[PDB]
Design an enzyme around this catalytic site. Structure first.
Site, mmCIF file in Angstrom:
data_model
loop_
_atom_site.group_PDB
_atom_site.id
_atom_site.type_symbol
_atom_site.label_atom_id
_atom_site.label_comp_id
_atom_site.label_asym_id
_atom_site.label_seq_id
_atom_site.Cartn_x
_atom_site.Cartn_y
_atom_site.Cartn_z
ATOM 1 N N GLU A 1 26.561 10.828 -9.574
ATOM 2 C CA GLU A 1 25.560 10.307 -10.529
ATOM 3 C C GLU A 1 25.962 8.943 -11.103
ATOM 4 O OE1 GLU A 1 22.608 11.409 -11.331
ATOM 5 O OE2 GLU A 1 22.532 13.408 -10.424
ATOM 6 N N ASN B 1 13.977 4.450 -14.275
ATOM 7 C CA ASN B 1 13.112 5.181 -13.354
ATOM 8 C C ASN B 1 11.697 4.629 -13.345
ATOM 9 O OD1 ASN B 1 14.856 7.940 -14.711
ATOM 10 N ND2 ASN B 1 15.170 7.155 -12.659
ATOM 11 N N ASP C 1 8.880 5.948 -13.898
ATOM 12 C CA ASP C 1 8.021 6.354 -14.995
ATOM 13 C C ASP C 1 8.375 5.664 -16.318
ATOM 14 O OD1 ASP C 1 10.321 7.751 -15.902
ATOM 15 O OD2 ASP C 1 9.420 9.720 -15.691
ATOM 16 N N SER D 1 11.245 5.912 -17.956
ATOM 17 C CA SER D 1 12.426 6.496 -18.557
ATOM 18 C C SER D 1 13.704 5.902 -17.950
ATOM 19 C CB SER D 1 12.397 8.014 -18.381
ATOM 20 O OG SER D 1 12.506 8.361 -16.996
ATOM 21 N N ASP E 1 18.047 6.856 -17.253
ATOM 22 C CA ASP E 1 19.170 7.812 -17.203
ATOM 23 C C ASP E 1 20.459 7.167 -17.736
ATOM 24 O OD1 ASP E 1 17.352 9.458 -15.886
ATOM 25 O OD2 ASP E 1 18.147 9.045 -13.922
ATOM 26 N N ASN F 1 18.471 11.987 -18.869
ATOM 27 C CA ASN F 1 17.210 11.255 -18.842
ATOM 28 C C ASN F 1 16.532 11.172 -20.200
ATOM 29 O OD1 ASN F 1 13.934 11.529 -18.388
ATOM 30 N ND2 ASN F 1 14.901 10.213 -16.891
#
Ligand SMILES: [Cl-]
Ligand SMILES: [Cl-]
Ligand code: NA
Length: 129
Positions: free
Chosen positions: A35, A46, A48, A50, A52, A59
């Site tokens: 990750e 991301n 959308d 958002s 991380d 998230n």
């Protein structure tokens, strides 16, 4: 901070993650490797809108507040910046809430695609724990 493999294993074990909800320590180290490459400061945006955050790429639409993800919950009740600290405590506490929410570690896409079903004990071999 960029952790070493065994350094992180030992920090995660001290914070209660070994066999937490049935997931051995190797699973958590493998997930962090893919990750974030063990970097507490990693961020990724991301599609959308958002983002991380941190060693376990938590998230902003569900789990932490970053002030720029409109329709978002803040279920771990922390600012997302707290997840980038060199102290992993906030990330671990929030990870424990995520893994308990019914879908286990399948919430982490890299775990599903790169750790699940593999020899995850290899990730802690050689470490003094
Ligand atoms: Cl393991
Ligand atoms: Cl599970
Ligand atoms: Na949020």
């Amino acid at each position: 901070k960029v952790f070493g493999r065994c350094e992180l294993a030992a920090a995660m074990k001290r914070h209660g993650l070994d066999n937490y909800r049935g997931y051995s320590l190797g699973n958590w180290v493998c997930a962090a490797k893919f990750e974030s490459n063990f970097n507490t400061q990693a961020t990724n945006r991301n599609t959308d809108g958002s983002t991380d955050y941190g060693i376990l790429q938590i998230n902003s639409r569900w789990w932490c507040n970053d002030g720029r993800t409109p329709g978002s919950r803040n279920l771990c009740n922390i600012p997302c910046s707290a997840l980038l600290s060199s102290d992993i405590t906030a990330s671990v506490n929030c990870a424990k809430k995520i893994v308990s929410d019914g879908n286990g570690m399948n919430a982490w896409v890299a775990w599903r695609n790169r750790c699940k079903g593999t020899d995850v004990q290899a990730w802690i071999r050689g470490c003094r724990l």
